[PDB]
Amino acid sequence: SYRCRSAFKLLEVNERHQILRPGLRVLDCGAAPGAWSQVAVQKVNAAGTDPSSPVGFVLGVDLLHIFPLEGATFLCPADVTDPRTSQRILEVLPGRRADVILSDMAPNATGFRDLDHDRLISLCLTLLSVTPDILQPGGTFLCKTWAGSQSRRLQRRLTEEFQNVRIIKSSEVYFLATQYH
RNA sequence: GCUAAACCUAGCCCCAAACCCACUCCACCUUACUACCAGACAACCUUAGCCAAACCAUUUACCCAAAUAAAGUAUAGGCGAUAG
RNA sequence: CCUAUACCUUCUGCAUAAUGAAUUAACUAGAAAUAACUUUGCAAGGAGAGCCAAAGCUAAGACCCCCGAAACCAGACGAGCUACCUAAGAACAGCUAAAAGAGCACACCCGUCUAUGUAGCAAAAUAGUGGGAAGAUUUAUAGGUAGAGGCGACAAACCUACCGAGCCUGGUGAUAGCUGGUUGUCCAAGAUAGAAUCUUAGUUCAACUUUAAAUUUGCCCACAGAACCCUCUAAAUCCCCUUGUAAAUUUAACUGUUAGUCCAAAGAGGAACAGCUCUUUGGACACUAGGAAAAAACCUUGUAGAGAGAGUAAAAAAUUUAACACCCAUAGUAGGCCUAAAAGCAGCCACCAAUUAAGAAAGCGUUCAAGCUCAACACAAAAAAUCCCAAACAUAUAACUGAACUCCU
RNA sequence: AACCCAACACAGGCAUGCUCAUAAGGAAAGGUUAAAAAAAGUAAAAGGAACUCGGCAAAUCUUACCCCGCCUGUUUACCAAAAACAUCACCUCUAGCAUCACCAGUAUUAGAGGCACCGCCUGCUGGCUCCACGAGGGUUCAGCUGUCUCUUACUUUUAACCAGUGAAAUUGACCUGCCCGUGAAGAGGCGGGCAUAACACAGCAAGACGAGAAGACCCUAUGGAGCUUUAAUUUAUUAAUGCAAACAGAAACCUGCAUUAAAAAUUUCGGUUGGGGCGACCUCGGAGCAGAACCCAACCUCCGAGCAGUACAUGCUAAGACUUCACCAGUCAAAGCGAACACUCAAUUGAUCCAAUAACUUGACCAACGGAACAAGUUACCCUAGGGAAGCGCAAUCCUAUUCUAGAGUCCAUAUCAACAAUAGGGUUUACGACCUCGUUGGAUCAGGACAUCCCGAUGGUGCAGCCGCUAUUAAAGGUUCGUUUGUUCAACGAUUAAAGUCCUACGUGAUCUGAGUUCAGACCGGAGUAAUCCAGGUCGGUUUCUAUCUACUUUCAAAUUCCUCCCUGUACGAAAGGACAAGAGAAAUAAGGCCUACUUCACAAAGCGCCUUCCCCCGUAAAUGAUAUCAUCUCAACUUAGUAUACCCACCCCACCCAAGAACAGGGUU
Ligand SMILES: [K+]
Ligand SMILES: [K+]
Ligand SMILES: [K+]
Ligand SMILES: [K+]
Ligand SMILES: [K+]
Ligand SMILES: [Mg+2]
Ligand SMILES: [Mg+2]
Ligand SMILES: [Mg+2]
Ligand SMILES: [Mg+2]
Ligand SMILES: [Mg+2]
Ligand SMILES: [Mg+2]
Ligand SMILES: [Mg+2]
Ligand SMILES: [Mg+2]
Ligand SMILES: [Mg+2]
Ligand SMILES: [Mg+2]
Ligand SMILES: [Mg+2]
Ligand SMILES: [Mg+2]
Ligand SMILES: [Mg+2]
Ligand SMILES: [Mg+2]
Ligand SMILES: [Mg+2]
Ligand SMILES: [Mg+2]
Ligand SMILES: [Mg+2]
Ligand SMILES: [Mg+2]
Ligand SMILES: [Mg+2]
Ligand SMILES: [Mg+2]
Ligand SMILES: [Mg+2]
Ligand SMILES: [Mg+2]
Ligand SMILES: [Mg+2]
Ligand SMILES: [Mg+2]
Ligand SMILES: [Mg+2]
Ligand SMILES: [Mg+2]
Ligand SMILES: [Mg+2]
Ligand SMILES: [Mg+2]
Ligand SMILES: [Mg+2]
Ligand SMILES: [Mg+2]
Ligand SMILES: [Mg+2]
Ligand SMILES: [Mg+2]
Ligand SMILES: [Mg+2]
Ligand SMILES: [Mg+2]
Ligand SMILES: [Mg+2]
Ligand SMILES: [Mg+2]
Ligand SMILES: [Mg+2]
Ligand SMILES: [Mg+2]
Ligand SMILES: [Mg+2]
Ligand SMILES: [Mg+2]
Ligand SMILES: [Mg+2]
Ligand SMILES: [Mg+2]
Ligand SMILES: [Mg+2]
Ligand SMILES: [Mg+2]
Ligand SMILES: [Mg+2]
Ligand SMILES: [Mg+2]
Ligand SMILES: [Mg+2]
Ligand SMILES: [Mg+2]
Ligand SMILES: [Mg+2]
Ligand SMILES: [Mg+2]
Ligand SMILES: [Mg+2]
Ligand SMILES: [Mg+2]
Ligand SMILES: [Mg+2]
Ligand SMILES: [Mg+2]
Ligand SMILES: [Mg+2]
Structure with a gap:
């Protein structure tokens, strides 16, 4: 049903907090292999499955190649921290904006999770720095x-901006x- | 050669016969064996079950007062184990 | 030196590393009658009333074990432990705080984690570390609720150190198709078709086996004889005079056995080569000995003792594997077709031909050519994990060795 | 009285008043030695979680979250202290009443329950938010430290020795060896080899499928029990009504009978298919099915049967036979009597009792079909009696190596690679629902071995210029790292390394240690069931013990490997780019064997974090001469060449003391 066990993690969060609904534009950072992308498409009706609900948009970005998925557009290879990808992301989304930002990016485990803590934090901060360009006001991150x-x-930075x-x-x-x- | 080993009574069992014990003084139903104050308290009412029927559910011998014989016969019984 | 794998019990098969046993002494386990048989008495009658009798009847002799549950029920005994409750008592430093099911922290209660301990100090403890410690607190004393029940802030907790239903006595020598055991000597006969079953751990019947009795055939087997199909097709079998032999049937009285295992052979399980499972036939084993290394099932051999005799049966694996040509080739032609051109060799139609004698090319190498050789002319493997595994030996005439089989005293 | 309860002169239990460190009460060391292992502490260079399932223990005093529960409290006394129960608050249900409970109460009351405060939205009930709190379950900052890198020293107990006292489990007999093979499938006892004077003492834990239990795994019993219910059998019991009885004139009580509910009692879970879910099956006939007398292949494979029609002598009797391997039941039948002039059909069926009936006769999907008159679930709370639980040569399938020479590799079978197959070795699977699922392993320590070689080494081929690859032969002496969990339990990821090999060894190894699973006594979430309860599911918590009798073993007493830099050398090689071998020097690491001068832990010493020493070959191939086969040809042809050990150890007073010697013993010194 899903490509990776991480799909259930997004479903569990969506069930309690209701962050995905039809008509929403969703960005999936680190989308490979496509576990969160499949979940997003079904919830936001990105493939137009339900005629009575608005059709959303799902965009997946990851360094590795991602196999095509119905109702989802994927950009690979592309670095989320690369300004070039951000410009390409805006040109693809309707209205050059997104409603929900989902991030599953994880750098390679260097064998020291303490070092991996700050490295992952900086990646999130880099996404947070470019977040205003991609996310629209009142969105979900x-x-x-x-x-x-x-x-x-x-x-602390999310608390000030959200x-x-x-x-x-x-x-x-x-x-x-x-x-x- | 040490530890040990050996013994013959104590008494008992089954019948017969015959119907058995129970006050020296003191204490003893209250916390028994405790000398010495007002209580009311009163006994009685089918046994069941294991077990047998190769389960189990109706049912399944239990001295009831003469040994023998009538006779394991007449009867009873998921008419069957068995009972008589 | 040579030979030899403890005993009991449970299984087809135990040296088995399956069960039981430290050992010694004592104790500890087959109780019964209808019939039948045998031995006496009497006899158409028998018996010391009854009862049987178409030779019976009376009496004697002679056959049927031990230990073990979890349970059920009845009547007693238990709340001095513990669960909850009643009556009337007691305990709670210090500090911060506030009139706190507050905080810190002794006494006190509890028992989170670790370690020690594990027949220990202890049938639940010690040490450290912990939770609470003015409260739904802790605790002393007396009383109460009792098992078809009590009690329970439900853990199916607790109710006197094994409570999904306490303990004790009695019914009780409960029952157990299950486990284990079942005591002197010697001889004899003795194994594998099935059916039913709340039945496959059992039992009954049959088969088989045993004993006694009566009787006359039994086994082996000459021809003859036993079906057509779906076309055809195996080893055989039944029946059965002779003959070799001595068994067979019937009657009477009962026990016990009844998945056997492996080997040879033919088959069965969706049309499955082995293996598995399951039938059929035969052998062996649960019966002795010898031989294949050790070896229940292969081969040899069975009827039982002693001998410091003898003759034989089966009975010892073989095999060591790859050379090779010598010489020569000029030419009617790049034989035509198609193909950029593919020529002897990309493909193809044709297969002639000079010279003593050479394929209108048999393999190679060129995009294609070139180069070459040949024809012709002369001249049959092996590798795994503790450490290879009898020692050895090509050449003195095949006899000898070898049993509990046979013979011999 | 030195005292009670715990089997003891028991490290436990034990109310209150004072003393709060004593004015009272006591003795941890029998003596010796200073081994190993084990226990308890103390100290530690540099690093500071790199240890580990986990920051368990210890040190230091240490922050910020998530999950669950509100909180204080309560529970499995003896493996679960929790997320479970209780809890204010809230909600539902029932009750209009006094003389032993509720209650000496009366709807703002009492009882039976749900749920778990409050706040918020919502239905008119559900869903969230949140204050504190917790020996709850995760995560994390900082600090901390022997948790570890990598252990070390010291003290005490233990220990060992001398003296006194003196157990227990255990035990068929033992005069108790190793390697292969074999075997009831894992041999100290059997076979073939080897080894072998006899004896204590101290260690070790490979074996004696070690000892004492328990748990678990399925299976069996016409063995139990607990619980649950629409399992069967009942309403005795209790309560409510009706009726009779009884009385008064209406009633009430009592009793009998009957009908309802309540509650309770008794009993049981039929076999077959590895288990479970879903299904199928159990009797009879036919085929595959035993080819030729009969019988005989279960399981398995496939098609049927549980009737119908025609008779109305389908009447009555009676020789002799068959028979589904027993019995029961079933089948054929001359003659005779009486009439006319043993029905078709492979199966087409059911005993006894009983019931009905004047009688003749009739009655069960008793289909579990040789049939009990009538009884289901669940147990992980379970109990009892038992029985079982490494190995199975030739077909299929997979892998490896050859064979075949198709096909790729520009050309080119064979530098590499390879289809359809075959041949050897290894592993796996296999008799029936052309259903679905489910039934020991890591780590620490110490390793033994195989070679089918990951690295180091030797040698061929190459589409090998050189470095560096590919491929093959040969080689097991030596080596084969440290960490993290997002793409988690040996799979990815990080940094390295000459390389981070494939395996076997009862997960090699649990009487050396530990984690998880198979799973269990508690508890929730999802799912199933009326319920009890269940699920290979998700999650939290959670007890095995062992004093070594025997075998084996306890200094092989001694030969070292690898990398890097430099050198050759920027040389050979190549157009450059790039870029070596061999020989030597130096340095480092690891391992093995030692040491204390310094340094460090520390001090008549031990020890590493310190220092010192470390020495043999390899057998694949490459060449000469030279016949069989007068050439040639490295020759399972005669022949030639290349690579085809030493050291250590070694004599024979002792009372007592000392020691760098040591558990005891022994040994050295005592001039
Ligand atoms: K009491
Ligand atoms: K004193
Ligand atoms: K807690
Ligand atoms: K051992
Ligand atoms: K039956
Ligand atoms: Mg019975
Ligand atoms: Mg029963
Ligand atoms: Mg032995
Ligand atoms: Mg024994
Ligand atoms: Mg004796
Ligand atoms: Mg009963
Ligand atoms: Mg009490
Ligand atoms: Mg009181
Ligand atoms: Mg106080
Ligand atoms: Mg308080
Ligand atoms: Mg406190
Ligand atoms: Mg309580
Ligand atoms: Mg519960
Ligand atoms: Mg329970
Ligand atoms: Mg008995
Ligand atoms: Mg005999
Ligand atoms: Mg039956
Ligand atoms: Mg004859
Ligand atoms: Mg003789
Ligand atoms: Mg020629
Ligand atoms: Mg002889
Ligand atoms: Mg003889
Ligand atoms: Mg001492
Ligand atoms: Mg030590
Ligand atoms: Mg340190
Ligand atoms: Mg830290
Ligand atoms: Mg680690
Ligand atoms: Mg770690
Ligand atoms: Mg971690
Ligand atoms: Mg700690
Ligand atoms: Mg709480
Ligand atoms: Mg509060
Ligand atoms: Mg407990
Ligand atoms: Mg308690
Ligand atoms: Mg606990
Ligand atoms: Mg609760
Ligand atoms: Mg608490
Ligand atoms: Mg003893
Ligand atoms: Mg010996
Ligand atoms: Mg062996
Ligand atoms: Mg010893
Ligand atoms: Mg049975
Ligand atoms: Mg039951
Ligand atoms: Mg017959
Ligand atoms: Mg039957
Ligand atoms: Mg039959
Ligand atoms: Mg449970
Ligand atoms: Mg090397
Ligand atoms: Mg090799
Ligand atoms: Mg072991
Ligand atoms: Mg805990
Ligand atoms: Mg030990
Ligand atoms: Mg060099
Ligand atoms: Mg020559
Ligand atoms: Mg030559």
Whole structure:
């Protein structure tokens, strides 16, 4: 039914918090192999499955090649931190904006999770720096994070730029931000 | 050669016969064996079950007062184990 | 030196590393009658009333074990442990705080984690670390609720150190198609068709086996004889005079056995080569000995003792594998077709031909050519994990060795 | 009284008043030695979680979240203290009443329950938010430290020795060896070899499928029990009504009978298919099905049968036979009597009792079809009696190596690679629902071995210029890293390395250690079921113990491997780019064997983090001469060439003391 076990993680969050609905434009960072992309398309009706509900848009970005999926557009190879990808992302989305940002990016585990904590935080911050360009006001932001002390700095910056920030908990920690300023 | 080994009574069993014990003084139903104050308290009512029927559910011998014989016969019984 | 794999029990098969046994002494386990048989008495009658009798009747002799559940029921005994409750008592430093099912922290209660301990100090403890510690707190004393029940802030907790239903006595020598055991000597006969079953761990019947009795055929087997199909097709079998032999049927009285295992052979399981499972035939084993290394099932051999005799049966694996040509080739022609051109060799139609004698090319090499050789002319493998595994030996005439089979005293 | 309860002169239990460190009460060391292992502490260079399932323990005093529950409290006394129960608050249901409970109460009351405060949205009930709190389950900052890299020293107990006292489990007999093979399939006892004077003491834990249990795994019993229910059999019991009885003139009580509910009692789970879900099956006939007398292949494969029609002597009797391997049942039948002039059909069926009937006769998908008159689930709370639980040569399938020479590799079978197949070795699967699922392993320590070689080494081929690849032969002496979990349990990822090999060894190894699964006593989430309860599902928590009798073993006493830099050398090679061998020097690491001068932990010493030493070949191939086969040809032809050990150890007073010697013993010194 799904390409990766990470698909159930997004469904569980969506079930409780209701972050995906038809008509929403969703960006999937680190979309490979496509576990979150499949979940997003079904919820936002990106493939136009339900004629009575508005058709959303799903865009997947990852370094590795992603196999084609019905109702989803994928950009690969592309670096999320590369300004070139951000410009390409805007040209593809309707109205050059997105409604929901989903992030599952994870750098290679260098064998020291403490080092991997700050490295993953910087990647989230880099996405957060370019987030205003991609995200529209009042949107939803979800990122995959590894627990650590630097999560507070990410939490502090999200708290200033978002009305509400939630902590969602493998040893993964997910930050759910809604109502972008 | 040490540890040991050996013994013959104590008494008992089954019948017969015959119908058995129960006050020296003191204490003993209250916390028994505790000398010495007002209580009311009163006994009685089918046994069941294991077990047998190769389960189990009706049912399944239990001295009831003469040994023998009538006779395991007449009867009873998921008419069957068995009972008589 | 040579030979030899403890005993009991449970299974087809136990040296088995399956069960039981440290050992010694004592104790500990087949109880019964209808019939039948045998031995006496009497006899158409028998018996010391009854009862049987178409030779019976009376009496004697002679056959039927031990230990073990979890359970059920009845009547007693239990709340001095513990669960909850009743009556009337007691305990709770210090500090911060506030009139706190507050915080810190002794006494006290509890028992989170770790380690020690594991027949221990202890049938639940010690040490450290912990939770609570003015409260739904803890605790002393007396009383209460009792098993078809009590009690329970439900853990199916607790109710006197094994509570999904306490303990004790009695019914009780409960029952157990299950486990284990079942005691002196010697001889004899003795194994594998099935059917039914709340039945496949059992039992009944049959088959088989045993004993006694009566009787006359039994086994082996000459021809003859036993079906057509779906076309045809195996080893055989039944029947059965002779003959070799000595068994067979019937009657009487009962026990026990009844998935056998492996080997040879033919088959069965969706038309499945082995293996598995399951039938059929035969052998062996659960019966001795010898031989294949050790070996229940292969081969040899069975009827039982002693001998410091003898003759034989089966009975010891073989095999060691790859050379090779010598010489020569000029030419009617790049034989035509098609193809950029493909010529002897991209393909193809044709297969002639000079010279003593040479394919209108048999393999190679060129995009294609070139180059070459040949024809012709002369001249049959092996590799795994503790450590290879009898020692050895090509050449003195095949006899000898070898049993509990046979013979001999 | 030195005292009770715990089997003990028991490290446990034990109310209150004072003393709060004593004015009272006591003795941890029997003596010796300073081994190993084990226990408890103390100290530690540099690093500071790299250890590990987990920051368990220890040190230091240490932040910020997530999940669940509100909180304090309560529970499985003896493996679960929790997320479970209780809890204010809220909700539902029932009750109009006094003389032993509720209650000496009366709807703002009492009882039976759900749920778990509050706040918010919502239905008119459900869903969230949140204050604190927790020996709850995860994660993390910082600090901390022997958790580890990598262990070390010391003290005490233990230990060993001398003296006194003196157990237990255990045990068929033992005069108790190793390697292969074999075997009831894992041999100290059997076979073939080898080894072998006899004896203690101290260690070790490979074996004696080690000892004492328990748990688990299915299976069996016409063995139990608990629970649940629309399993069967009942309403005795209790309550409510009706009726009779009884009385008064209406009633009430009592009793009998009957009908309802309540509650309770008794009993049981039929076989077959590895288990379970879903299904099928059990009797009779036919075929595959035993080719020729009869019988005989279960399982399995496939088609049927549980009737119908025609008779109305389908009447009555009676020789002799067959028989589904027993019995029961079933089948054929001359003659005779009486009439006319043993029905077709492979199966087409059911015993006894009983019931009905004047009688003749009739009655069960008793289909579980030799049939009990009538009884289902569940147990992980389970109990009892038992029985089972490494190995199975030739077909299929997969892999490896050859064979075949098709086909790729510009040309080119054979530098590499390879189809259709075959031949050898290895592994796996296999008799029936052309259903679906489910039934021991890591790590620490120490390793033994195989070679089918990952690295180092030797040698051919190459589409090998040179470095560096590919391929093959040969080689097992030596080596084969440290970490993290997102793409988690040995799979990806990070940094490295000459390389991070494939395996076997009862996961090699649990009487050396530990984690998880198979799973269990508690508990929720999802699913199933009326319920009890269940699920290979998700999650949290959660007890095995062992004093070594025997075998084996306890200094092989001694030969070292690898990398990097430099040198040759920027040389050979190549157009450049790039870029070597061999020989030597130096340096580092690891391993093995030692040491204390310094350094460090520390001090008459031990020890590493310190220092010192380390020495043989390899057998694949490459060449000469030279016959069989007068050439040639490295020759399972005669022949030639290349690469075809030493060291250590070694004599024979002792009372007592000392020691760098040591558990005891022994040994060295005592001039
Ligand atoms: K009491
Ligand atoms: K004193
Ligand atoms: K807690
Ligand atoms: K051992
Ligand atoms: K039956
Ligand atoms: Mg019975
Ligand atoms: Mg029963
Ligand atoms: Mg042995
Ligand atoms: Mg024994
Ligand atoms: Mg004796
Ligand atoms: Mg009963
Ligand atoms: Mg009490
Ligand atoms: Mg009171
Ligand atoms: Mg106080
Ligand atoms: Mg308090
Ligand atoms: Mg406190
Ligand atoms: Mg309580
Ligand atoms: Mg419960
Ligand atoms: Mg329970
Ligand atoms: Mg008995
Ligand atoms: Mg005999
Ligand atoms: Mg039956
Ligand atoms: Mg004859
Ligand atoms: Mg003789
Ligand atoms: Mg020629
Ligand atoms: Mg002889
Ligand atoms: Mg003889
Ligand atoms: Mg001492
Ligand atoms: Mg030690
Ligand atoms: Mg340190
Ligand atoms: Mg830290
Ligand atoms: Mg690690
Ligand atoms: Mg780690
Ligand atoms: Mg971790
Ligand atoms: Mg700790
Ligand atoms: Mg609580
Ligand atoms: Mg509060
Ligand atoms: Mg407990
Ligand atoms: Mg308690
Ligand atoms: Mg606990
Ligand atoms: Mg609760
Ligand atoms: Mg608490
Ligand atoms: Mg003893
Ligand atoms: Mg010996
Ligand atoms: Mg062996
Ligand atoms: Mg010893
Ligand atoms: Mg049975
Ligand atoms: Mg039951
Ligand atoms: Mg017959
Ligand atoms: Mg039957
Ligand atoms: Mg029959
Ligand atoms: Mg449970
Ligand atoms: Mg090397
Ligand atoms: Mg080799
Ligand atoms: Mg072991
Ligand atoms: Mg815990
Ligand atoms: Mg030991
Ligand atoms: Mg060099
Ligand atoms: Mg020559
Ligand atoms: Mg030559």
